[model samples]
Target chain A: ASMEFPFDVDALFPERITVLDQHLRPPAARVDLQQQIMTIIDELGKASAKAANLSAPITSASRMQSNRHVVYILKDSSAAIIGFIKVGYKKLFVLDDREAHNEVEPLCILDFYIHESVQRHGHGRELFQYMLQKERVEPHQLAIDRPSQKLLKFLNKHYNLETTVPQVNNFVIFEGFFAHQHRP
Target chain B: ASMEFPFDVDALFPERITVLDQHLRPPAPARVDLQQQIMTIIDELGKASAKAANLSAPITSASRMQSNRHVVYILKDSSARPGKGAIIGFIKVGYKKLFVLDDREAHNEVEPLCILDFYIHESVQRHGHGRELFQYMLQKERVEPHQLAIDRPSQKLLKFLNKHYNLETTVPQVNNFVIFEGFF
Candidate 1:
């Protein structure tokens, strides 16, 4: 069964599959497994990589499964299925005056390799838009790399991502909309 | 008066000198002071580089003092410096999940080019090997590019560093003692 989203899901998907193709590998055989199956696939992908031989090339499946903290998004169409994102959580340790402070944090997209066969299908963008919508009310920072210029620009223009010079690198932290809601 | 330490301080001084030369230009001039002065020079060097208009070349001495995270170590002639190891800390972020987790946990080196210098004199070798102790405090679970080998005399120390830090050390050649990346 196909899942229906409340908003314009099509608009959320990329207009062409090029962007998605850059990030994900093609899905294996088409299967109509339930949503839970998709979740398992993502988890296994992360975990397998974590447990695999350190010298081998890392696979999306292994990374998804091994991730202890994450939010996975999967999108399916009649002919093919795609796993869009595998966002993970980490506890950042900030050292000040010989003291370390740990903070729970969310990463925008992690190990997001799209399927090769589904190239130019707009699935990646759809997954990204879906994540932004879902995280709107969540109280956590979203971090992205400057190399992903398209994603970075989209976040700044549409999602109210704030630009801060925290380091020499061009990474920008997108403060969650719910920042003030949980403020003490 | 020359500082005297319990261990072979002279042997470790050359390594520390090498580290300084590797990172700073005109390495000899940079080695102005043998102790506290060296730390101040490296600190100021970092700040100078950060604020200078000529991003490529080294900055003025005035600039180096402002960059707080960058540090320099001098294996003293004496055992006056209390800490077994001296570290330079800075902030960084990563697009890759491994780095993100490693950075968040402060577990990996070479994530950023923020470290200024580190040194453990020979006299203090038995007290707490600088490399081993630093790795323990940092909690690095693994090392990359593992084909490298350490100096013949330092082989045992290298092995200890690898085992203690959970480092791979498989690189073809040994480039530097340690490299790490993480956020502030």
Candidate 2:
């Protein structure tokens, strides 16, 4: 019915979406990790689309293998201080705005998600910073697509990225994204 | 080989585009009923824009101009006659009461200047007249491009905007408006 989330500024999600990780007692959670991943991916895709009021999904696990974006899958663990966790991955792109379309192997954050129960708690920054460092890209270089209300702030605060350059696509790039790129 | 008008800053005409009197004419101007002719162009272009946007009714009707809020700028085929012209297109703007969202997704009830509707004759598009009309409006309003809000836009408007202004990556809004960055 309502793609509405349990967003009370986080941590009211006790019933609908909470608790993950197999206890290693039932041994079921451990075995169902792959299925759990799929569920998270699907649900996340739906939520992302719904938030933007978009009818068609632009991000999903359906194109995962085909696109081959550079993501290895990440989640939380150990007693779930963070009610629950879902799949998080980069949709990927090439730096077309500044690098002049370098054909990057994973140039931008095409999609991102964190549950309503654990938002505004800096987990996204943690995960995203990890993504940046692991990929060896500067915070100034990546592109953003259709970022919602919160993610833009998350970027504003965490990355100091405010002022964006114009683009013809669904991409956004802050200033100084081209100071080091080439011309010729 | 063109008919670009040697225009006063107060009367900048791309020949393809011209602004109508706001329901009033100075004493020095005479002979033809310019307001009546302009209203005809406005009404026709309004219908064409509504048809282009698939609206049940025209939003850019010339009747709205008498309110002294909305202004009409028409594109014309001056080459058809030495001093007379045939209507080729029109764009209208107004100040509308809107709840526009800021960068952080906060909705503020504001009455910002808005680009309500624009239309170009199918036989006369892709020739850069739309850009001239838009530029003149921006200058006429004395507002920067980022300060105006676009009401529900057509695909052609979107492409025109992206091509010339790079205004993609909109802030997803609950209302029918589409907004780009740098909107304070």
Candidate 3:
């Protein structure tokens, strides 16, 4: 469900897709504008968590402030935020087919979403494509943090990222991960 | 921080203490107003707790509460006159099947009462409100402090337990649940 705030959401986001850093601050930003931005992010995170059937929200304005992750937000024409994807570098120990483990810090897709109303319209792909190009990381080389079944399907359909390696942690690594990753 | 809603919270909860079950139908009846207030309180408190613990989201919420068979004990302070009454905090508990390790590190399957969430309003924290609410719950449930299992307790909660019940020296397990000696 889209949470309606009191402010003009469209005015708040001047760009079609805004990239917010840990600071969540824009140049010439006001305190009230910052609060409004925070409200949107918190609501979006809550909705994403609900959509994922999670016990709690994994994304919030406060959480964004503390972490070094980059959040990509997509806004539609009507000032309604379509969705967002949160990505960060994480240290993970992943196992290959041989059951051997490798410790690597890879760019992980932490959380991703596309509003239900506009799903299957290539919006997710557009956002994912933008994120991949901006981060300069190939799909197979990235670690997916507890990806949903839908996300797996999307990755499979878009990048042919199937045949995941077994992992002890929540992150999922594709078959080509080790091939592209340089051992530390 | 406590968030004030537009409605009269004081009138919604007239009693000093209210105990709610999974139904949340209230001891009186199915009052939509009271139910909404309960949901707001649960949601807001959960959000606050999640922020305090640096969790991605709240572990306690009205939606989750409806699906689970847990008991929530809500306490309000009558001495506060400005808002008529202030919500002190709440403790949610339920029986969960857990594989616990004993002093010998042996895995044992047991179903015990677990403290799912314990949150006191930050404004009223350290005023003995938590102790008061906890003591009342222990008495109501007829469960010993040590018999209870805590789900991924924060450092503050650990210190609280240590100071209040002398519950030090925990039995370490791979799972997040914390148990002390005499738990078995």
Candidate 4:
């Protein structure tokens, strides 16, 4: 309801979510594709922000270039970019509390977005499953930063990632998070 | 025994188990020696645990601690050498909100004390020294083991909890962690 994609939902993504690399771009398509990416990021940032009722856009062309994440674009059959999803891994020390004493640096899902138009069409799950396979991560292990109600439901329905450790930072870890053992 | 604090513990604190600051420093005189040794402790423990193992973050260094306004509780043995003695262990906790699931896989968002970084000397692993340190933390923080969620734990700890706290039957989470069920 809040975001409008410029392409048709059904035909856009039987196979979509294309990875766009800023540094490893082919010179010929680099400038054009990069510009297109900026438009997508800038626009989507505004769109998701508006959905969250934020005052202004938190993403930008400048912001996109300075970060470590890779962006994936949703494309229609005709090659018109309909929308995009931003996914990245944040490697940090996390307390899994599973080991009598152990830990892990599993890749974390940073941020994600699906064009509102094609959202309910199973496109998000398709993109997510593909991302997991591409990166070789366990589904529940791929956590997202503070997710939305819609995104939560999406994960619960598809991957069954429903439990998580309580959070202090906006690190946005999800269920599949275990606590530590002690006290006998 | 695996950790060394060069500062004079006898002169540093009047009692055993004197809690260190978020920087792992004691009082004012904890100066140059305090900072250096504490940083060394932080660095090594952040990598390989003396008790078990461990990040770079707002909670890792003193400056970072101030940046995020978090606290680090460093436990020590004054009698080991007096004043600035050996480092027994440490625990870092912070207050934050989180979404946790019940036994039935329902998610609820609540804020509670999080036991972030925890450690006990490898030589003292099963010696109940961890309890002394943990107890000090419990008393100082005014939170229960059940009220507090343990992050990334070791197997010895899991067995320890099962044997001591009757903690068993946990939800499966991939990366790591354990939240105990309390009789609330």
lDDT of each: 0.36, 0.57, 0.80, 0.57
Q: What is the lDDT, from 0 to 100, of the residue B145 in candidate 4?
A: 68
The i-RMS of every model, in angstroms, reads 21.4, 17.3, 14.2, 20.9
lDDT of 4 by residue, A52-163 (tens): 3345555555666776666665655544545555666565555443423224555666556554334466667777777777777776666566565556667789977665
CAPRI rating of model 1: incorrect
Give me the chain B TM-score of candidate 3. 0.92
Chain B only, TM-score of each candidate: 0.29, 0.78, 0.92, 0.74
lDDT of 4 at A73: 58
> What is candidate 2's lDDT per residue for A1-184, written digit by digit as tens?
1123222312222232332222211112344554444444455566545333355555555544355444323343421222222222344444544545443332666666544334455666766766676668776666776555556667788878774556555566665466564323
Please give, as one word, the docking class of candidate 2: incorrect
Worst 10 residues of 4 chain B by lDDT: B50-59
lDDT, residue B4, candidate 1: 34
Q: Candidate 1 at A159: error in angstroms?
A: 1.9
DockQ, structure candidate 2: 0.02
TM-score of each: 0.29, 0.43, 0.50, 0.42
User: Tens digits of per-residue lDDT for model 3 on B1-184?
Assistant: 2446656656767776778887876544348877887888888877766754546668889999999998898887667455535677788999999999998889999999999988776555666778889999999899999999999887667778999999998989889899998898
What TM-score does model 3 achieve against the real structure?
0.50
- The true-versus-predicted C-alpha distance at residue A26 of model 4, in Å, is 66
